[PDB]
């Protein structure tokens, strides 16, 4: 267990970055190594992150 | 900064800034066909025209500050995975250590420039890497064959060739050039509306409902321009032997006391084909000089039959698979998601049978056991953790981390199951 | 109220035979096999009377002089560079043709714009060809499966 | 068909080994193994 804040859920729910998690999900049942499927699902998270770093200062 | 203030507020007011551009372009577009030298007139208001001169200015305007929110919008995030990409790249091979990008592969070689700027990891936050690698893998080298490959009064005080390094990354974004297109697309017919109205190819882009209907096609066009390539070779071949032998069943002659045209020149009996007999479609045997006895005949009798299928079955298997086979494609790829998103988890990835022997339990075990987003609200909580104040866990998965590796992930190896 | 109406003028009762519709059970599903379909059907032609409205102002530019309606000229002659028309000519005629376009056009035998003429008809064709075969057959068979 | 045949492969390529033809399930109860199980267990040009 852990914390999880607020406003990062506030950043989290917009259907914009939702949907590029669909997309996402569509592309990755599609190709990719799957030794490396979370690897890049890693790098999806730490720029999805990032975006929503992006999404607080507005 | 009131500006840099107000620069975020079309940060702030993109899309809804993107649907309204193609609001005026319709009323734009739609009295286009309003117009007659060339006269336009007016129907029902007073200054109709003149409302024109209005719209094209105010038009142009509006496809400026949508690239500008969208400037620091994508770029900002584009720059920074191509940036997140060199420090991941140059710390796990260290390819400007050692492997120096090949004859091809532009990317990391516009980048060959990136290197030594001295203000280089600007949204990576990890900075010390331009030196780490230079104490991992500059260790085995000289330190300054290193460091001399790493590391108002504002006309001369940025990282200059940085930005002119970040250019050629930003051009190859294709929607930055696609709006800067759109933006080029409204300076010249604005300035002559004759041209004004290939605004409306924006509808591409335009409801995303749409564009299952090009993808539909567009991932296939590889094997389309074959086919098309097939077919001009086929006449091509096709015109030859009547060019050899029925050239004289080829009139466009009204009568022959006309100046009677035959089709036995250098190079336009070919063109007369494939511009009549293939937009003729009912067979080429409604076109030539129709026979009724000859021995010829014969074989032009033959020669539409033979053609009238090769009308027929050519174009026809050309199009039909890519309108259907082209399509049930797509019917599957959205079927596709549906079954690991219902029978397997995605994170375990096991299966329905055992996160719903217990009842109602497979969802939320998908809800709870790996309810995937927690990770990512979970690694935002670890980034703004204390390393000093981690955990045993907060330390552990740190380190895996910090490795790239991930193995502490339930791979297909859930909880419940080693259970009882 | 279907019935008072077209009992009260025979010009216009005969479509209660509209309630086949929900007559044949059977039928049924052959209406619902493009029903569901037509949220998509009508950006399909949607896009349709655009690209032709892209289509005709090049002409209309270029080539309305290729644009006879007309019997000889001697006749009162028609062009298509009025208000708009051209375009609706277009629909009408072009997209009721099928045989192409380049059969109703005033046609070539010597122009230097006949080139651009040439090319005009033929990536019309295709957008007569592989437009409204890729509207229509996944709508009568990707809708079918 | 040829959707499908190109398809066709896709399965135990995927699925099962091509040698002892089992299941990814076996071979990923070990993390990232099947695909290794079928580039050590099995790896089959080394057969050849
Ligand atoms: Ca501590
Ligand atoms: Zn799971
Ligand atoms: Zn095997």
């Known amino acids: 267990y852990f914390e999880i804040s607020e406003s990062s859920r506030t950043q989290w729910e917009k259907p914009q970055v939702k949907e590029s998690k669909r997309q996402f999900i569509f592309d990755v049942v599609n190709e990719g190594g799957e030794k490396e499927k979370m690897e890049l699902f890693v790098n999806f998270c730490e720029d999805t992150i990032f975006e929503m770093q992006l999404a607080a200062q507005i | ?420």
């Open chain 2, 1 to 420: 900064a009131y500006q840099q203030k107000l620069l975020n507020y079309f940060a702030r007011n993109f899309y809804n800034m993107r649907m309204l551009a193609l609001f005026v372009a319709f009323a734009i577009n739609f009295i286009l066909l309003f117009y007659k030298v060339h006269y336009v007139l007016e129907e029902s208001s007073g200054y109709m025209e003149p409302t024109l001169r209005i719209l094209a200015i105010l038009h142009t305007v509006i496809s400026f500050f949508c690239i500008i929110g969208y400037y620091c919008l994508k770029v900002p995030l584009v720059i920074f995975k191509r940036e997140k990409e060199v420090a991941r790249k140059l710390e796990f091979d260290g390819l400007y250590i050692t492997e120096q990008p090949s004859e091809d592969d532009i990317k990391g070689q516009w980048d060959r420039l990136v290197i030594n700027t001295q203000s280089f990891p600007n949204n990576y936050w990890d900075k010390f890497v331009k030196r780490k690698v230079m104490d991992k893998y500059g260790e085995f080298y000289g330190r300054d064959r290193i460091s001399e490959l790493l590391g108002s009064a504002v006309l001369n005080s940025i990282d200059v060739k940085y930005q002119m390094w970040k250019l050629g990354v930003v051009f190859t974004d294709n929607s930055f050039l696609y709006l800067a297109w759109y933006m080029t697309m409204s300076v010249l017919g604005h300035y002559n509306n004759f041209f004004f109205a290939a605004h409306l190819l924006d509808i591409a882009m335009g409801f995303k409902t749409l564009r299952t209907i090009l993808s539909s096609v567009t991932h296939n066009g590889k094997q389309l321009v074959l086919t098309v390539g097939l077919l001009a070779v086929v006449v091509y071949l096709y015109t030859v032997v009547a060019f050899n032998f029925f050239r004289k069943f080829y009139n466009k002659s009204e009568d022959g006391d006309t100046p009677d045209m035959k089709c036995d020149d250098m190079l336009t009996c070919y063109m007369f084909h494939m511009y009549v007999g293939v937009r003729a479609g009912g067979g080429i045997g409604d076109e030539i000089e129709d026979p009724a006895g000859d021995e010829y005949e014969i074989y032009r009798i033959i020669f539409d039959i033979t053609f009238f299928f090769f009308v027929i079955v050519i174009l026809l298997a050309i199009i039909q698979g890519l309108i259907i086979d082209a399509f049930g494609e797509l019917r599957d790829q959205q079927e596709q998601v549906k079954e690991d998103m219902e029978t397997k988890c995605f994170i375990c990835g096991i299966g329905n049978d055992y996160f719903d022997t217990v009842p109602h339990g497979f969802e939320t075990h998908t809800l709870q056991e790996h309810n995937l987003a927690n990770y990512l609200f979970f690694l935002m909580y670890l980034i703004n953790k204390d390393e000093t104040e981690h955990t045993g866990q907060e330390s552990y998965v740190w380190k895996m981390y910090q490795e790239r590796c991930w193995e502490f992930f339930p791979a297909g190896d859930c909880f419940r199951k080693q259970y009882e």
